[PDB]
Design a protein around this ligand. Sequence first.
Ligand SMILES: CN1CCN(C(=O)Nc2ccc3c(c2)[C@H](NC(=O)c2ccccc2)CCC3)CC1
Length: 219
Amino acid sequence: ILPDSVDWREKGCVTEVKYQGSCGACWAFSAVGALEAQLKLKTGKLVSLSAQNLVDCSTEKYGNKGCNGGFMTTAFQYIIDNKGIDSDASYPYKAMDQKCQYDSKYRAATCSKYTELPYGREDVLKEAVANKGPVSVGVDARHPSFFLYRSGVYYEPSCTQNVNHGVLVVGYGDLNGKEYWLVKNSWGHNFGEEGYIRMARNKGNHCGIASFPSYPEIE
Ligand SMILES: CN1CCN(C(=O)Nc2ccc3c(c2)[C@H](NC(=O)c2ccccc2)CCC3)CC1
C-alpha cells in the first residue's frame, strides 16, 4: 500500500533550489536533483551535484546542447559512462557553455543505471516516487500561468503533453481535495512556493508530467 503523500524534503533528500538564469540547463538540474537523492539514500550525505559538469561534458555524444537543452536520461548515461560527476562546490554553475573540466578528484557521486517509466502512467510514477525517490520529469512550462504560479495546485486547461522543461518530482499529496505532484524547479526561490510548484495529479497527465519520467540508481 503506497502512502497517501510523500515529501522527500522531509527525509533530507533534496538540496537547495537552484537558479538556472538565462541558460536552458533545466535538464541538468533535474538530473542532478534525482541523483542527489540517491546519493543521500546510499551514503547518508546530502550534497549538491554539478549541473555545470553536465552542461559542459554531457554534450553532442549524448544528444545534448548545453544551455540550449538536453535530456535527463542521456545525462544519467554520461555519468555512468564517465564513472562519476563532480560536486557543485568543485565545479560551480556559470549559466554558460564551457569546456569540459571534469576531474575525478572532485567526484561526489556515481551512477550505475537509470530507469525510464512507462509513458503517461501516473500510478507508476506515484509508486516510483514512494519507493525509489525523486523522479526526473519533463513538463509543459510554456504557458504564461506557469511563470506566475504562487500557490495552490496548478491546473492549466491550455497545458499539453508536449514537454519542454526538465524538473524534479520530490513528492505528491492532496491539498484541499486536489491531488498534486510536488515539483522542484530551477528558477530560484522567487519562483512559486520557494522554488516549488504543486502540479495537478491524476488529471489526465496534466502538462505531460508523467510523459517521460526517469530516475537513476547507485550501485
Ligand atoms: C523516446 N524518447 C522520447 C523523448 N525522451 C525524453 O526523455 N524526452 C525529454 C524528456 C525531458 C525533457 C526533454 C525531452 C526536453 N529536451 C529537449 O527539448 C532537448 C533539447 C535539446 C537537446 C536535447 C533535448 C526538454 C527538457 C526536459 C527520450 C526517449
